[PDB]
Structures are given as C-alpha cells and as structure tokens.
C-alpha cells in the first residue's frame, strides 16, 4: 500500500533519475522496475524474461533489487533491450548485463553508440551529452524485427525522433481474466539539441524525425509507457489516479512531440534575419 505516484512525488526531474522507487505491476507479465525518474521495464515468462533500459550509469543495483523484490531472479532475464542510446537510459546496460548474463539486442541505428559508449555524430545533443560504458550488441535488429523469448514476442520499431538510435517497443499483455492489451514502450520523442545545433541544417535528421513521429503515432498502443514516466503520466495511471488503458495515447503523444518540433523549426526560421 505504497504507490509509485506518492512514493515519487516531486521527483520527475533530475533528483529522481538515480532515486529508488518501489517496483510496480504494469499489466500481465509486465512490470515497472525502474527509478522515480527513469523507467526500466521487465517482461516475464517461464522461459525467461526481457528487460528494457538500465537507468543511469549508477542505477544497476536499484533495478536489480526491484527485480528480486518482485520475486524474480535476475539470472532469468535473457535479453536486455534499450529505448535510446543516452546514458540516463542505458548508462548501466553493461553492469546490468554481466550481473545478469543476458544478451543485448538493438536496432542498427543504435549499434555504433552502444558498442562505443559515445553518442553519435548525428545526434543533435553531442557533444553536450556524456557517454557511458560500452557493450557488445549480440543481435542487431532492423525495423519491424521481433525479440523472441519462448512465447514472448517484443517487436521493435526504429523511431528516430529524439536520437538517431531511438527505438520503440510493442507487445501483448493479458491480465488474470484473459483481457489482453498491447503495451507500447514508446521512446522519448523530444527534439532537443546542443545550442549551436540547427535541425534546419540536417535534412537527414529532419527526415528521420518525421519517420519516427509517424511510426510512434501508429504503434499498437492500448497502454502507453515512456522511458521518462511523466512523459506518459505513468505513475498516476499505475496508481489508479488516471486511466491505464487509452488506445489513443501514442497518437496524442506523437502529435504533441511533432507540435514541439514544428515550433523548433519555426524558431530556427525566424533566426534568418
Ligand atoms: Zn535522450
Ligand atoms: Zn531521457
């Protein structure tokens, strides 16, 4: 009787990223096991589990504990996946992997950063953002691929709105009464950069953004979940304060991110004196 929502009140910002949160149940075989600021998703089967995102570089033990505190063995997670290739979300993929033995799978657009720890030359945020400890990508994926673990099937989309390597994930979950819902772990969708960076000068990046917004908006999406919980109002929805199921969430979320992006392009235009 503790609640993610009240347990993390006021910790949406930086203070929360490495700040411990009680694990929670999202739906069916899917569990929140991240911190107050950064999500980490556990997807369970008898055949083994899948885990998405590590949280910041120092957060490995926090989520390792949230796993056990739920009655699951971290030795049972067979795959570690990622939303996108920034330290706050993947910063301890490495430590999380050797503490678990899992293999790592990722979209090709992310592989280079993941295997080097340095953000991509195409990332609007380098070299503002910092790096994290590298990892070897065992299975490198293409848009529409499926990570399969027994009857588990997590299917990935390249969604490059926020970074070049951004990925969004989708899978089915069913409650105790065999009501089934599609969960969408839709990546951060914010178009943000270092100061000197201009999207107008990078048509590749702009075209990839449009592709990502379009794919995010069309994900099968009964239950939206975001690498930053507040981006999808996740703690209130998990804590009965707001509706957990809303099949229109991904569309609205993408529409909003796209609205933000257009304001940013307009700002860059009006800097053309
Ligand atoms: Zn990021
Ligand atoms: Zn983030």
CATH number at residue 83: 3.60.15.10
Out of 12, 76, 143, 197, which one is annotated catalytic? Answer: 197
Radius of gyration in angstroms for the set of CA atoms belonging to the chain, rounded to a whole number: 18
Q: Which domain holds residue 13?
A: 1-273
Q: What is the resolution of this structure in A?
A: 2.6
Ligand (nearest to CA of 192) = 1
Distance 268 CA to ligand 2 centre (A): 24
Crossing angle of helices 249-269 and 203-218, rounded to 10°: 160
76 is catalytic: no
Cβ neighbours for 47, distance < 8 A, ≥ 6 positions apart: 78, 149, 150, 151, 152
Pairing mode, strands 77-81 and 103-107 = parallel
Give the chain's end-to-end CA distance (angstroms, integer): 58
Is 89 one of the catalytic residues? yes
Q: Name the nearest CA neighbour of 154 among 36, 233, 42.
A: 42
Cα–ligand 1 centroid distance for 99 (angstroms): 24
10 Å CB burial of residue 28 (0-12, 13-18, 19+) is: buried
Out of 19, 49, 87, 162, pick the active-site residue.
Answer: 162
Q: Which residue is it, tokens 């999808």?
A: 232
Q: Identify whether 87 is a catalytic site residue.
A: no
- 214: tokens are 């379009």
Q: Give the residue among 15, 16, 13, 50 at the shortest CA–CA distance from 30.
A: 50
Question: What experiment produced this structure?
Answer: X-ray
What's the structural domain count of the chain?
1
Distance CA 101, CA 257 (A): 36
Biggest CA pair distance of the chain: 62
């Amino acid at each position: 009787p503790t609640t993610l929502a009240t347990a993390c009140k006021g910790l949406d910002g930086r203070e929360g990223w490495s700040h411990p949160a009680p694990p929670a149940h999202i739906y069916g075989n899917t569990w929140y096991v991240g911190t107050c600021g950064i999500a980490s998703i556990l997807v369970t089967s008898d055949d083994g589990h899948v885990l998405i995102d590590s949280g910041p570089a120092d957060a490995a033990p926090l989520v390792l504990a949230n796993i056990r505190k739920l009655g699951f063995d971290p030795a049972d997670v067979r795959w570690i996946l990622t939303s996108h290739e920034h330290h706050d979300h993947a910063g301890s993929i490495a430590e999380l992997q050797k503490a678990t033995g899992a293999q790592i799978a990722a979209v090709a657009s992310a592989r280079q950063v993941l295997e080097s720890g340095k953000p991509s030359a195409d990332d609007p945020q380098s070299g503002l953002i910092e790096g994290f400890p590298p990892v070897h990508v065992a299975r490198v994926l293409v848009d529409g691929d499926s990570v399969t673990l027994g009857r588990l099937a997590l299917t990935v989309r390249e969604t490059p709105a926020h970074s070049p390597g951004s990925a969004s994930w989708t899978w089915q979950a069913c409650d105790e009464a065999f009501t089934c819902r599609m969960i969408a772990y839709a990546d951060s969708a914010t178009t943000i950069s270092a100061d000197d960076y201009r999207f107008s000068d990078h048509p590749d990046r702009i075209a990839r953004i449009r592709t990502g917004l379009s794919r995010i908006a069309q994900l099968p999406c009964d239950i939206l979940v975001t690498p930053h919980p507040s981006a999808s109002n996740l703690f209130d929805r998990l804590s009965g304060k707001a509706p957990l199921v809303n099949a229109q969430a991904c569309a609205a979320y993408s529409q909003a991110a796209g609205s933000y992006f257009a304001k940013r392009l307009a700002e860059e235009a009006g800097e053309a004196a």
